[PDB]
């Protein structure tokens, strides 16, 4: 489970209305919830068990090789989506899996400013303040709201490896 103390390997933290996750750098893909590696372009015998996409690795078929999503993920337009999130719409946000839930359940996590509206099938339509919990401890970095999600970025005066 991703927290504010998570170190995204070759990635960075972002915050939505109800969860945190790691976004990868450039064209990297998520090998786990907190690690980004390079996606292999074509699976073969040498790239066995190597990441080929977000939450997907290379598998061997007894002889061919394909890119399959991890257990519990469904492929929707070549990206792996959690199973219980296939039939779940959220609008101003995305569907995420509730890790701690005893039963497999999909919940809506909203862009900053919205909360799940219990009077609208818990879709993202009710206005709600989401306080930024990100700890931007880099040089001259702070929590800015960029494109509906919280992230760490340079302050009012500094810009671009270290903010200046």
């Amino acid at each position, epitope marked *: 489970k991703v927290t504010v103390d998570t170190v995204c390997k070759r990635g960075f933290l972002i915050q939505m209305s109800g969860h945190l996750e790691c976004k990868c750098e450039n064209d990297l893909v998520l090998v786990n919830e907190e690690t980004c590696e390079e996606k292999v372009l074509k699976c073969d015998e040498k790239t066995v068990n190597k990441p080929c996409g977000d939450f997907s690795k290379c598998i061997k078929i007894d002889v061919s090789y394909a890119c399959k999503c991890n257990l519990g993920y469904d492929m929707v337009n070549n990206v792996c989506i959690p199973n219980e999130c296939k039939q779940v719409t959220c609008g101003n946000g995305k569907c995420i899996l*509730d890790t701690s839930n005893p039963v497999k359940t999909g919940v809506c996590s909203c862009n900053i400013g919205k909360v799940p509206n219990v009077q609208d099938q818990n879709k993202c339509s009710k206005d709600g303040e989401t306080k930024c919990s990100l700890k931007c401890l880099k040089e001259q970095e702070t929590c800015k709201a960029v494109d509906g999600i919280y992230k760490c970025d340079c302050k009012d005066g500094f810009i671009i490896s270290i903010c200046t």
Partner: antibody, heavy 125, light 106 residues
Framework: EVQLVESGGGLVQSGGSLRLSCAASGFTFSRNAMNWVRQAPGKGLEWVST????????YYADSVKGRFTISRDNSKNTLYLQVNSLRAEDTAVYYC??????????????????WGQGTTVTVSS | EIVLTQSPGTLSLSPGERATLSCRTSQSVSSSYLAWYQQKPGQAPRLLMYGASSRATGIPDRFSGSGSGTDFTLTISRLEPEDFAVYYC??????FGQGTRLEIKR
């Protein structure tokens, strides 16, 4: 509004089979986990089984494993409870419930907010 | 399957008093998955608290839910005649409690 209507109860001899159903209306059925909760006469609530929104995940109480079977048909917005070899202790009112959440102050809090009227099963010779 | 123990078995109070109902789990559970329910004689159960503290729709503000780890308490202050019923706690996807019954004291 949201509605859950149950049917399939009635009298049945000891060791018989029954198929309970719960017709849902007023919400996207496939996105919510469903539950069966029964209550024997003069007794308290007893959770029977729970199924995920897609139906790929099912959960059962130890007192009903083996005999009971929960399933759902999202094309018809219907929940089912298949039972075989009914014991005398199965005499109860069987409710269905919708399992949803309420995002309140940073947490997704869950519960069974919508219930049906319940169908009565009676196992006796 | 955990074991939820509710206390007391029967709570006899007068209208206008404060009611404290306890629910103790055999293990530790997240507060987001332990709900409270109310049932009138002859009626279907009704959700009281999403999780441990989030009041469900239509539930009066005098109902208050608190709890953490293994201890959870439903607090009903300024009891009214419509509040005297049977109350259950449940771990989401698991078992219920034995239920606490609220009876008018006269």
């Amino acid at each position: 509004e949201v509605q859950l209507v149950e049917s399939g109860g009635g009298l049945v001899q000891s060791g018989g089979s029954l198929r309970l159903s719960c017709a849902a209306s007023g919400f996207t059925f496939s996105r919510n986990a469903m539950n069966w909760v029964r209550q024997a006469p003069g007794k308290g609530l007893e959770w029977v089984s729970t199924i995920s929104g897609s139906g790929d995940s099912t959960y059962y109480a130890d007192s009903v494993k083996g005999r009971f079977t929960i399933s759902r048909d999202n094309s018809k917005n219907t929940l089912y409870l298949q039972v075989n070899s009914l014991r005398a202790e199965d005499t109860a009112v069987y409710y269905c419930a919708k399992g949803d959440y309420y995002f309140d102050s940073g947490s997704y809090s869950f519960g069974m907010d919508v219930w049906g009227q319940g169908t009565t099963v009676t196992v006796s010779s | 399957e955990i074991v939820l123990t509710q206390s007391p078995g029967t709570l006899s109070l007068s209208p206008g008093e404060r009611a404290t109902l306890s629910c103790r789990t055999s293990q530790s559970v997240s507060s987001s998955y332990l709900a409270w329910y109310q049932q009138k004689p002859g009626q279907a159960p009704r959700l009281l608290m999403y999780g441990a503290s989030s009041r469900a729709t239509g539930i009066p503000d005098r109902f208050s839910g608190s709890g953490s780890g293994t201890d959870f308490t439903l607090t009903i202050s300024r009891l009214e005649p419509e509040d005297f019923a049977v109350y259950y706690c449940q771990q989401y996807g698991n078992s219920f409690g034995q239920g606490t019954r609220l009876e008018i004291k006269r």
